[PDB]
Amino acid sequence: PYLGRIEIMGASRRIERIYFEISETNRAQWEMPQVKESKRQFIFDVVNEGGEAEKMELFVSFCEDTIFEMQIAAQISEPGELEVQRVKFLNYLSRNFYTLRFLALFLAFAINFILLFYKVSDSPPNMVYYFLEESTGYMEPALWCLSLLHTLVAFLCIIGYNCLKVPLVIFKREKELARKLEFDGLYITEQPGDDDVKGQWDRLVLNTPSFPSNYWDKFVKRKVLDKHGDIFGRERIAELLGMDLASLEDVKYQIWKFGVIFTDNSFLYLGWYMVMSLLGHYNNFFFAAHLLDIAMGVKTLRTILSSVTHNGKQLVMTVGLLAVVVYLYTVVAFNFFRKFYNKSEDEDEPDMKCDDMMTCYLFHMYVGVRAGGGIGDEIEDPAGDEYELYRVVFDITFFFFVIVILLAIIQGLIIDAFGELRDQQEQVKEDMETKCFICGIGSDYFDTTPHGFETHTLEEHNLANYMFFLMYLINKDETEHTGQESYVWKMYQERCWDFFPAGDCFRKQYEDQLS
Amino acid sequence: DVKYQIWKFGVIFTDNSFLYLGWYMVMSLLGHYNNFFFAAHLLDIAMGVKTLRTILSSVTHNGKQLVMTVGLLAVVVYLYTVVAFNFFRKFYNKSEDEDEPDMKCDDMMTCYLFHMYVGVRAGGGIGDEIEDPAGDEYELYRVVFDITFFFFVIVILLAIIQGLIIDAFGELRDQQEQVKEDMETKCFICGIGSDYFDTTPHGFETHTLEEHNLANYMFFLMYLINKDETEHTGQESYVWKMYQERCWDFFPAGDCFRKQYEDQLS
Ligand SMILES: Nc1ncnc2c1ncn2[C@@H]1O[C@H](COP(=O)(O)O)[C@@H](O)[C@H]1O
Ligand SMILES: Nc1ncnc2c1ncn2[C@@H]1O[C@H](COP(=O)(O)O)[C@@H](O)[C@H]1O
Ligand SMILES: [Zn+2]
Ligand SMILES: [Zn+2]
Numbered sequence: 001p002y003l004g005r006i007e008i009m010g011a012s013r014r015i016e017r018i019y020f021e022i023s024e025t026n027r028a029q030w031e032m033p034q035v036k037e038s039k040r041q042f043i044f045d046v047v048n049e050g051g052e053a054e055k056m057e058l059f060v061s062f063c064e065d066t067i068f069e070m071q072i073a074a075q076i077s078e079p080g081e082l083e084v085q086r087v088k089f090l091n092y093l094s095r096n097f098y099t100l101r102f103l104a105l106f107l108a109f110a111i112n113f114i115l116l117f118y119k120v121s122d123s124p125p126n127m128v129y130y131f132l133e134e135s136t137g138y139m140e141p142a143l144w145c146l147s148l149l150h151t152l153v154a155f156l157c158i159i160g161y162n163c164l165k166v167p168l169v170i171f172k173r174e175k176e177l178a179r180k181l182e183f184d185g186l187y188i189t190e191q192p193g194d195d196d197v198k199g200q201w202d203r204l205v206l207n208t209p210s211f212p213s214n215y216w217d218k219f220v221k222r223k224v225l226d227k228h229g230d231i232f233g234r235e236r237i238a239e240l241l242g243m244d245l246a247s248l249e250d251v252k253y254q255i256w257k258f259g260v261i262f263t264d265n266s267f268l269y270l271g272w273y274m275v276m277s278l279l280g281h282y283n284n285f286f287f288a289a290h291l292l293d294i295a296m297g298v299k300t301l302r303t304i305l306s307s308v309t310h311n312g313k314q315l316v317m318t319v320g321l322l323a324v325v326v327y328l329y330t331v332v333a334f335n336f337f338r339k340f341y342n343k344s345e346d347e348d349e350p351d352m353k354c355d356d357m358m359t360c361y362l363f364h365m366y367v368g369v370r371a372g373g374g375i376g377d378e379i380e381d382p383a384g385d386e387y388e389l390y391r392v393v394f395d396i397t398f399f400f401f402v403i404v405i406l407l408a409i410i411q412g413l414i415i416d417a418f419g420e421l422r423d424q425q426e427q428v429k430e431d432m433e434t435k436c437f438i439c440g441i442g443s444d445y446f447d448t449t450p451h452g453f454e455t456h457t458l459e460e461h462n463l464a465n466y467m468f469f470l471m472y473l474i475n476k477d478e479t480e481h482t483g484q485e486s487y488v489w490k491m492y493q494e495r496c497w498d499f500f501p502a503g504d505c506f507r508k509q510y511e512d513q514l515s
Numbered sequence: 516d517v518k519y520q521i522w523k524f525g526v527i528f529t530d531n532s533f534l535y536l537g538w539y540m541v542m543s544l545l546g547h548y549n550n551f552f553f554a555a556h557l558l559d560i561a562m563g564v565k566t567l568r569t570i571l572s573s574v575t576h577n578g579k580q581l582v583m584t585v586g587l588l589a590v591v592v593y594l595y596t597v598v599a600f601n602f603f604r605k606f607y608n609k610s611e612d613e614d615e616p617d618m619k620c621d622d623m624m625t626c627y628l629f630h631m632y633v634g635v636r637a638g639g640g641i642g643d644e645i646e647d648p649a650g651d652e653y654e655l656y657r658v659v660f661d662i663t664f665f666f667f668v669i670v671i672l673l674a675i676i677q678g679l680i681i682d683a684f685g686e687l688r689d690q691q692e693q694v695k696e697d698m699e700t701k702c703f704i705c706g707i708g709s710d711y712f713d714t715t716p717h718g719f720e721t722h723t724l725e726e727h728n729l730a731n732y733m734f735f736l737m738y739l740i741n742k743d744e745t746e747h748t749g750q751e752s753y754v755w756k757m758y759q760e761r762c763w764d765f766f767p768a769g770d771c772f773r774k775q776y777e778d779q780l781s
Contacts, residue, residue: 112593419682
């Protein structure tokens with residue numbers, strides 16, 4: 001239950017097994033369903049768009065993100081007066097962030113249910129008047145209290161997000177910047193261009209005293225100095241990083257953090273939610289924009305809409321193609337078929353829709369594309385004229401190419417998106433169930449022993465066990481490190497992932513003795 | 516055993532097939548009160564014909580996604596209703612008479628009903644059902660309104676529904692194909708692939724029909740259950756105890772007689 005075992009390619013050039021204790025809180029926080037979903041999304045991402053060389057780097061990054069999330073969850077878990085009450089309230093919002101997010105979705109549907117009882121009258125209950133019409137009389141007070149409650153809940157959602165999810169954003173940003181500083185020399189040798197807005201903005205935090213505040217590595221500045229001093233000037237590097245080399249013998253940081261947060265998509269969405277909730281008090285119908293949150297909420301709806309967004313570039317390109325081809329038909333009509341576009345039944349005021357190129361394009365794009373039979377179901381009958389056969393060819397080509405072919409292209413794009421997403425999921429599942437994540441040896445090898453692959457993935461090469469070992473190493477002070485622990489610790493500090501068993505396992509190595 | 520009988524009655528009355536047959540009997544009884552209640556028995560073709568049940572499995576396979584897409588259509592049509600009720604109220608007069616205007620969007624409930632009904636059952640959307648926008652100051656806004664309705668509701672969402680059905684057809688087909696492929700390329704009992712047994716001609720067929728026939732395992736369970744324990748032989752009693760303990764290690768997992776004694780069979 002607590003005996004966590006891994007296999008690492010050791011210093012002796014042989015696969016060896018390491019044993020460590022897994023904490024119960026860490027085990028429960030791993031079994032948490034949000035963490036399970038994070039793991040599932042990571043696995044899908046890697047298997048779908050990943051590489052063999054990049055896989056271990058991505059896996060270690062995912063483990064580090066998970067470890068930080070576990071620490072945040074432990075901080076917010078259930079345990080002068082102003083500070084003690086503030087901490088409890090802020091932690092309460094973080095533990096209940098998703099309940100508030102679901103509470104705001106119920107308040108959006110509750111409010112929009114009231115709005116269906118609206119009416120418009122010229123006379124008060126020329127400026128028109130809007131009012132709720134209900135005999136119960138409780139709908140209007142319910143609407144008022146529900147709008148106030150909804151704005152309150154949106155604000156609480158923003159605060160809970162800032163206390164829950166913003167730390168991970170800052171941790172990711174700091175660790176990426178530290179890695180670019182140390183193992184790439186980005187601001188020392190590379191100096192990113194103006195096109196990298198993120199790289200240009202990150203220059204603010206280098207000089208700050210508390211540059212690492214969420215990322216656990218408190219020796220990043222020392223390591224960057226030690227690596228790049230002899231090559232780029234110790235005094236220059238110290239001035240760049242805001243570190244006093246003589247002592248070796250935060251408004252700027254806060255502004256940087258605010259920029260990082262305000263460039264975050266989820267925070268921007270929550271701010272938009274709060275803004276529209278504030279405008280819902282100026283006009284009640286602005287609360288209808290919160291119904292759009294069902295997409296960002298319900299996972300079923302998000303999966304359904306992924307079929308639309310998967311080929312979104314092809315969909316907009318096909319719409320532009322439809323616009324071009326309807327322009328071509330408009331050219332042909334405006335030059336040869338102008339007389340058939342009279343939309344006025346009166347014999348005194350002809351309402352020609354194709355005596356102008358802009359008007360004929362608007363008429364085509366609107367009515368000939370929304371019509372079932374094309375533009376021939378909307379313009380004058382061609383029979384009897386000299387251009388009858390030309391008009392028939394015109395209408396039938398419009399019907400075939402625009403009504404049939406192009407709408408078929410759009411619908412086929414959606415259907416192909418459904419099929420492609422299904423087979424992506426199937427391929428990820430097949431890879432995971434037929435191959436090992438850590439070593440890549442197929443299940444056929446392990447299945448020689450009954451339940452061999454399940455035993456291998458649950459005991460020997462459990463990626464969860466590797467994550468728990470990283471937690472163990474990070475938490476354990478280096479003084480108490482054992483030999484193999486220090487070997488793996490140095491390989492992790494150098495960002496070298498050769499200690500992961502690649503294509504070799506304990507059974508494969510010692511099958512001779514296990515026979 | 517009144518308590519046992521009441522328990523059995525509860526178990527039966529919570530059974531879906533028995534409940535369906537009771538519903539059939541109830542509607543047949545009501546067919547004597549009104550003859551047209553016998554039309555509900557035509558629905559039994561689905562629970563009957565296997566072809567019809569397979570066809571309807573395409574509809575029910577993505578049923579959750581279908582109802583979610585219907586709810587999404589309802590939400591987006593509500594949004595269009597909001598925009599119409601606030602900016603396009605004058606185009607929703609459905610009365611040709613010049614004395615009694617039958618406005619369909621002076622009320623939020625009425626405009627939602629009008630949208631959900633006619634703009635979704637219309638081929639061109641709500642612009643094929645409301646007043647022509649040409650000549651008004653809001654002409655371009657109304658054109659954008661109608662064309663977005665046509666693209667998003669008429670085209671995109673109905674395409675989502677039809678794609679859900681088509682993907683259900685394909686998914687069910689490939690499920691059947693994968694089951695057939697697994698059965699014809701691997702052994703049910705031991706899991707050793709047909710490639711191993713095919714070294715001997717007709718080796719896999721011989722293995723599945725003679726050596727590891729799941730039907731033979733079923734018949735052996737019949738044999739063990741029917742045979743009184745006094746007459747059990749040694750291996751029979753071994754398997755009997757393993758079956759009483761619900762331990763299934765006596766099934767050959769990854770090993771077979773040929774694999775074990777290939778040295779002597781050579
Ligand atoms: N190195 C690995 N560690 C853990 N599970 C693995 C590994 N490689 C493949 N798997 C598979 O991943 C799945 C884990 O199930 P789940 O935790 O529900 O995603 C099982 O099918 C395992 O056989
Ligand atoms: N252990 C097994 N026992 C019997 N049939 C098996 C077994 N493993 C695979 N099969 C296959 O199952 C199919 C039996 O055909 P049927 O009885 O019509 O379903 C054949 O393709 C067999 O090769
Ligand atoms: Zn492995
Ligand atoms: Zn077999």
